[PDB]
Point group: C2
C-alpha cells in the first residue's frame, strides 16, 4: 500500500455536477509529493463554462493521499492502496447553500484517478457564491475520528468574501477504504492542517491552478 | 520597521539560567528568511554542560521576527524595529515543573540579537525532563490576542517522551514592543502554526542544531 505510493505521484480528476441547476464538467491533472504533503492541480471547466458561481465551492472537491503523516500516525489513505478509497461530504454554508460530494480514488498504472460528483442547492442568488465575490479559503484544521474501519472528518471552513468578511461552511466527510483482503492499521483521533491556495486563473475561472499543503499532527 | 528586516537575516543569542538548581549558559548563531517563516540556529552549552535535563525545555526559548505573516495580518514583531520587542513566558508542565523565561530582542549592525534568562523549578527527579527521556515538541498552534499595546500568546505544547507518550506544557507569553513612541498597526486575534525540528546534536546535547517553520493564519 504505502509501497505503491511513490515520493512523486501524478493525479487526474473528472468532476461532474449541478449547482443551483447549472450543469458542468471539469477535468484536472497534477502531481505532488505525498510524503511531504504538497500537491498542484491544473483544472479546466470543459462543459458548462463559464460557471455562474464561485469556483471556490468546487476547489475542496479536487486529494487525501497527499497528506504528510508523521511516523506515529498510521496513514489510512496510503494504506488503502492498491484498492483505494471513497469519500462522501456535506458542505453547509451559513447563508443556506448546501453541497453534497461523492468521490472515488483509485490507482491505475501508477496514476491516482479521482472521479467526483457534486450537487449544490439553495445558494442565495444575491449571495457571494452566486455573485462570484469570493477570494479563496482560509487555512483550516480538520479533526479526524476513527469510525468502524472508516474515518470521519469535521472542519469549519471560512470562505473569504470581497470586502474582507467570511462565509462560514461546515464540512462533514466519511472516508472509506475499498480494501477487503489486507488489513489497515487504524489511527486514533488526529488533526490535519490544510492550506489550499489558488496560484492562477484565466478565462472567467474556466482554467484554475491550485496548490495544497496538508500535514497530519498530534491532537491534545 | 519591516524595511530593516531583510529577506535573509542572521541572529545571535545568549541564554543563561538555572533549572532545578543547575546553572548553565548557552550561545547560539543562525540565520533564516523572516518573510518565509523559516530559521536555523546552532546552539552551544558553554557553561554547566552537560545539562542533567532535556535540552527540549530550552529549545522554545532560543525568535518571533521569523514568523510568516500573510498580507492581512499586521506583523507586531517586524513593525517593532528598530527598537525591537521583549517577551516573558511561563511554561507549566502537567507533572509540576515551572519555567519563567525573560527575553530581549534587538537589532545591531543588521544582526538580530537575543538575550534570555530561564528559571525552572520543581521538575520531578524521575520525570522525563530530569531523566532526559524526551524526543522533541509536537507541531502546535499558538493563539495570539491583542492586549493594551502588546500581544498575549496561549498554547498547549506536547513534549514527546521515550516510548511514545506525551508530557503536556501550557505556555502563556506576553509580547511587548520597545517602540513606545510611534504608530504600530495592531493585529486582531490570530493563530501561529509552529514546527520546531532538531536537525543535529553531539556531545550529550551540548551542541544542538534546530530548525523552525512558523506561519501566522486566520483564526
Amino acid at each position: 500500500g504505502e509501497e505503491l505510493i511513490k515520493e512523486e505521484m501524478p493525479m487526474k480528476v473528472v468532476l461532474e455536477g449541478t449547482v443551483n441547476g447549472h450543469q458542468f464538467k471539469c477535468t484536472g491533472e497534477g502531481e505532488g509529493r505525498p510524503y511531504e504533503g504538497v500537491q498542484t492541480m491544473r483544472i479546466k471547466v470543459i462543459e458548462g463554462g463559464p460557471l455562474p458561481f464561485a469556483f471556490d465551492i468546487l476547489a475542496t472537491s479536487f486529494s487525501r493521499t497527499f497528506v504528510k503523516h508523521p511516523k506515529g500516525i498510521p496513514d489510512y489513505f496510503k494504506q488503502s492502496f492498491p484498492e483505494g478509497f471513497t469519500w462522501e461530504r456535506v458542505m453547509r454554508f451559513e447563508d443556506g447553500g448546501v453541497v453534497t460530494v461523492t468521490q472515488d480514488t483509485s490507482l491505475q498504472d501508477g496514476v491516482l484517478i479521482y472521479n467526483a460528483k457534486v450537487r449544490g442547492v439553495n445558494f442565495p442568488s444575491n449571495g457571494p457564491v452566486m455573485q462570484k465575490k469570493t477570494k479563496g479559503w482560509e487555512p483550516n484544521t480538520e479533526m479526524i475520528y476513527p469510525a468502524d474501519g472508516g474515518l470521519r472528518g469535521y472542519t469549519d471552513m471560512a470562505l473569504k468574501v470581497d470586502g474582507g468578511g467570511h462565509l462560514h461552511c461546515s464540512f462533514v466527510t466519511e472516508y472509506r477504504s475499498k480494501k477487503t483482503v489486507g488489513n489497515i492499521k487504524m489511527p486514533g483521533v488526529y488533526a490535519i492542517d490544510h492550506r489550499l491556495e489558488r496560484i492562477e486563473e484565466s478565462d472567467n475561472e474556466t482554467y484554475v491552478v491550485q496548490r495544497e499543503v496538508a500535514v497530519a499532527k498530534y491532537s491534545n
